[PDB]
Amino acid sequence: EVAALVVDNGSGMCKAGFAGDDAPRAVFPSIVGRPRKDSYVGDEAQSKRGILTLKYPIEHGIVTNWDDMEKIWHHTFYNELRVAPEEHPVLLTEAPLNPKANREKMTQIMFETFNTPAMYVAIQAVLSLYASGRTTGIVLDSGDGVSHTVPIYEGYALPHAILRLDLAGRDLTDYLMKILTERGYSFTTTEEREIVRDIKEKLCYVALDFEQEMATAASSSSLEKSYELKDGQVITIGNERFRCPEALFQPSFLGMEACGIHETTYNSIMKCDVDIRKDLYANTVLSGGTTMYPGIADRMQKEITALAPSTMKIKIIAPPERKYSVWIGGSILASLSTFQQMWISKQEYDESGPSIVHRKCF
Ligand SMILES: Nc1ncnc2c1ncn2[C@@H]1O[C@H](COP(=O)(O)OP(=O)(O)OP(=O)(O)O)[C@@H](O)[C@H]1O
Ligand SMILES: [Ca+2]
Numbered sequence: 001e002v003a004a005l006v007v008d009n010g011s012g013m014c015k016a017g018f019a020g021d022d023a024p025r026a027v028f029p030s031i032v033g034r035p036r037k038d039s040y041v042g043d044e045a046q047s048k049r050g051i052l053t054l055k056y057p058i059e060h061g062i063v064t065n066w067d068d069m070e071k072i073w074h075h076t077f078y079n080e081l082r083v084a085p086e087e088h089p090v091l092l093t094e095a096p097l098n099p100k101a102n103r104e105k106m107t108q109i110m111f112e113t114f115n116t117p118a119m120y121v122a123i124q125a126v127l128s129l130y131a132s133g134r135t136t137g138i139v140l141d142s143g144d145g146v147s148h149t150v151p152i153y154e155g156y157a158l159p160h161a162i163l164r165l166d167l168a169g170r171d172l173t174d175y176l177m178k179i180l181t182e183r184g185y186s187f188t189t190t191e192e193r194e195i196v197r198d199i200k201e202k203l204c205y206v207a208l209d210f211e212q213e214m215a216t217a218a219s220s221s222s223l224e225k226s227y228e229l230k231d232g233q234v235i236t237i238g239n240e241r242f243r244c245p246e247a248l249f250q251p252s253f254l255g256m257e258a259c260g261i262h263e264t265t266y267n268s269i270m271k272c273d274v275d276i277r278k279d280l281y282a283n284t285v286l287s288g289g290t291t292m293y294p295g296i297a298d299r300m301q302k303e304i305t306a307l308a309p310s311t312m313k314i315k316i317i318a319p320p321e322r323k324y325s326v327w328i329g330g331s332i333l334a335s336l337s338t339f340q341q342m343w344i345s346k347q348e349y350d351e352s353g354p355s356i357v358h359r360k361c362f
């Protein structure tokens with residue numbers, strides 16, 4: 001048969017490729033822009049922020065604007081991948097607990113706007129579990145605009161226990177800007193957010209112990225690293241390195257009341273049947289770009305261990321490529337001989353309409 005396409009749309013980044021590959025073929029920004037061609041998507045839209053009025057179709061993980069998304073998909077198919085959708089089964093990914101209505105429009109749009117011969121909508125968190133080699137376990141997926149702790153058992157996500165923490169890599173990028181500014185630098189523009197995001201990605205890490213790290217940085221220079229601007233200037237970053245991602249465990253640094261990611265994972269586990277919690281503790285999988293900070297795994301271990309019973313075996317799984325675990329899970333799933341029957345065919349759609357996405361998905 002032909003090649004299945006795996007499209008993973010995020011709040012900040014869109015990843016797309018072909019099932020069978022172990023990495024997406026294309027990855028671009030999830031922003032669209034129209035004058036203030038006729039529309040612009042990705043980097044090209046970002047380089048005209050001035051002349052175009054930009055939009056962000058995916059917000060906190062949920063498609064907020066459809067014609068915007070329809071355009072991102074058009075971009076994916078014809079520009080990035082260069083394939084005719086009507087010639088490839090497409091596998092989409094959606095955020096946990098995304099409304100039943102969005103699920104139907106995704107289906108409807110794929111069959112009536114792009115003429116896909118088949119398609120399927122899968123839950124992101126679950127695709128990551130599949131990618132780690134498990135069917136049972138709790139996932140902490142943290143992207144650029146939203147975090148979710150998702151308990152899964154025997155391949156099914158547990159809807160009543162899924163939690164949402166609106167604190168991801170974006171908040172972290174702005175926070176790093178704020179603290180480097182207070183430090184004496186000045187990072188406030190959109191072009192600079194782009195620079196600080198890179199800083200955050202190459203120099204930041206999670207301290208095993210906040211205070212001790214802070215104490216070493218106040219009395220020593222050992223934790224400092226240098227970063228060079230395209231313009232040539234070298235700037236140093238010390239405690240901002242760990243102080244930035246610490247906001248994941250302590251949202252109050254950002255004036256947020258929500259509890260940390262470690263505590264949110266623990267709260268999701270407890271909303272579960274006491275008979276499967278051990279399976280979750282021993283199978284806590286880290287997913288998403290925000291979970292890439294050096295030292296986050298050891299930290300999560302220590303924080304969970306302290307929140308859970310002393311007789312509890314805790315194990316944090318952090319795949320080296322978790323930045324794309326979601327997409328790889330879709331590449332892995334759409335390849336399975338047993339998943340071929342899950343696809344929603346054009347035929348199945350015509351006869352049963354959009355409401356069939358609940359019957360074949362989920
Ligand atoms: N090495 C890294 N260290 C820390 N953060 C990183 C790293 N690499 C990428 N990120 C951050 O990961 C975020 C993007 O991750 P991802 O693409 O998984 O999320 P998304 O799908 O775009 O959005 P979301 O899943 O929350 O709706 C960005 O904030 C990016 O800066
Ligand atoms: Ca995502």
Ligand SMILES: [Ca+2]
Nearest residue numbers: 250251252257
């Ligand atoms: Ca707090």
